[PDB]
Amino acid sequence: EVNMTSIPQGVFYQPHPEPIIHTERVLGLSQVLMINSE
Amino acid sequence: CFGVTFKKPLVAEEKTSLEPQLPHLQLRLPHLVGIIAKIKGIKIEVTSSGESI
Ligand SMILES: *[C@@H]1O[C@H](CO)[C@@H](O[C@@H]2O[C@H](CO)[C@@H](O)[C@H](O)[C@H]2NC(C)=O)[C@H](O)[C@H]1NC(C)=O
Ligand SMILES: *[C@@H]1O[C@H](CO)[C@@H](O)[C@H](O)[C@H]1NC(C)=O
Numbered sequence: 001e002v003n004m005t006s007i008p009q010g011v012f013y014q015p016h017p018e019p020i021i022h023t024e025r026v027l028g029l030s031q032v033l034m035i036n037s038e
Numbered sequence: 039c040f041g042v043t044f045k046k047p048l049v050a051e052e053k054t055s056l057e058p059q060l061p062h063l064q065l066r067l068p069h070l071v072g073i074i075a076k077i078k079g080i081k082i083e084v085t086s087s088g089e090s091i
Contacts, residue, residue, distance in 0.1 A: 032053045 027048070029050045031050065034053055034055055036055070
């Protein structure tokens, strides 16, 4: 058997679960880790 | 200024130090050397029987 549903105006909607960020600006930084065993 | 808002630059810490947390087993056999030292000095005393008599 088959299952049916008629789309009214030919427009369908997809889930698309990933977020959308819309960034503002990008920054740059520097840092030192200093691994020590003592 | 105009429509855009300006924010101050952020200062950054120069260095970081890593000190990870370690599990504590809490074993009890270590630091028990005193008991071994006590075992070393048993010092059983036996006096000859018949030398006096
Ligand atoms: C290394 O030894 C020290 C000293 O025995 C341990 O520090 C003790 O840890 C216990 C459990 O947290 C505390 O109740 C004591 O007060 C601590 N004593 C001191 C002097 O700090 C330490 O836990 C040990 N390290 C490991 C990884 O077992
Ligand atoms: C398809 O339709 C039948 C009845 O026509 C129904 O029993 C079945 O559950 C439907 N399947 C779906 C909705 O996936």
